[PDB]
Structure 1
Amino acid sequence: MSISISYSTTYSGWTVADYLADWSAYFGDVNHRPGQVVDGSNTGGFNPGPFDGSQYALKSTASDAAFIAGGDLHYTLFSNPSHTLWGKLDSIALGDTLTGGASSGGYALDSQEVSFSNLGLDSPIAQGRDGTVHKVVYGLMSGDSSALQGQIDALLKAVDPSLSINSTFDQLAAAGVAHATPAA
């Protein structure tokens, strides 16, 4: 159904924008860039794979911060248009301590802080790295959550014009969009 948000009560009073800007700055720019993509270090991984998955997950190299992108995702790797993540992006989960993978019961976060589901985003292969899905996820890899913020802002304003990326998680909970969980 519509955009749904889970959040630890640690962040009840934070705006979605302030939370995301802060999380991104922490996670940092992993430098998944030309000549700097290094296997076992900053590539991330797909479940079930190979370069497609219901999940793409990546841990920060500077901390235990990690994200899991979920949906029906495809990555072109070296083939035309190269290094494009496209397909359906349904969810983004943010937190610390990535566990699991393709051999396990999928990727998970030991400490999930915030998750966004029913994002409703699709991008065609045809846009390459100009596609919205690509920009959303690559943004989170490069320490810049602007693209994700823009998508969430649009979804929230469609729910109600008083709601935006600059609304707090508690405000979104009263409006039935978000749901709190104790910090664990």
Structure 2
Amino acid sequence: SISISYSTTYSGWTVADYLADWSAYFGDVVVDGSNTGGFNPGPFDGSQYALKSTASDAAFIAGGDLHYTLFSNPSHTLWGKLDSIALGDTLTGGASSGGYALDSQEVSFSNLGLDSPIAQGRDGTVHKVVYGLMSGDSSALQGQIDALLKAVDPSLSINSTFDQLAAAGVAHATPA
């Protein structure tokens, strides 16, 4: 089931609270090179999709087995399997580096278990999750995390603190 890493800095924050603040920090991103983001290995598919903010040093990384349709029907659909979302700050590496990595990784969500097929187009969950983050709207990631936590134990939710989810077996603290 879902597993979570967090920086001690965020020990007392609720996930809903952390994800709202992370997204306002990242902001909203005409599409061009500064703005498309990147796939590993790419160009339009890979095990990792990563995007830097145009506004701040915030950065994120979506991992699993992902496919972007670009202009093919249904256009501008991200689909595939999404296993991880890693949020933080200052993106590094890429296709010729062997993977994207965050220099300062604040929080990660792993074993999401999300899978959307091409046929749902842009209404697919994987699409609505990653596109949300690109756009400064983590609400779709929030909604999805909330369901994973609830199925583990009906007491846990995006309004649990990270530390409470550590007590629950789900989260695991790291330095800062």
- TM category (shorter chain) comes to over 0.9
Task: Give 1:50 shift.
Answer: 2.0
- Show the counterpart of 1:22: 21
Give the counterpart of 1:139 among 129, 132, 135. 132
Cα deviation digits, residues 20-55 of structure 1 (max 9, x gap): 00000110011xxxxxx4332110000011210100
CA apart distance, 1:114: 0.1
TM-score by length of 2: 0.98
- Rounded to whole Å, the distance in 1 between the matches of 2:17 and 2:43 is 35
Q: Deviations over 1:40-91 (max 9, x none)?
A: 2110000011210100000000011000000000000011000000000000
Residue aligning to 2:53? 60
SS at match of 2:43: coil
TM norm structure 1:
0.94
- Aligned counterparts of 1:40 and 1:50: Cα–Cα separation in 2: 13
Segments of 4+ moved more than 4 angstroms: none
Of the candidates 145, 149, 152, which is equivalent to residue 156 of structure 1?
A: 149
Q: Distance in 2 between matches of 1:79 and 1:96?
A: 32
Match of 1:33 in 2: none
Q: Deviations over 1:121-143 (max 9, x none)?
A: 00010010010000000000111
Indicate the percent of aligned positions where both proteins have the same amino acid.
100
Distance in 1, matches of 2:98 and 2:58, equals: 20
Alignment coverage as a number of residue pairs: 176
Q: RMSD across aligned C-alpha pairs, in angstroms?
A: 0.7
Give the match for residue 75 of structure 2: 82
Structure 1 unaligned residues grouped into runs of 5+? 31-36
Separation (CA, whole Å) in 1 of partners of 2:75 and 2:31: 17
Paired with 1:4 and 1:16, the residues of 2 have a C-alpha distance of 13
Aligned partner of residue 32 in structure 2, secondary structure:
coil
Output the CA distance in 2 between the equivalents of 1:8 and 1:117: 15
Aligned to 1:173: 166
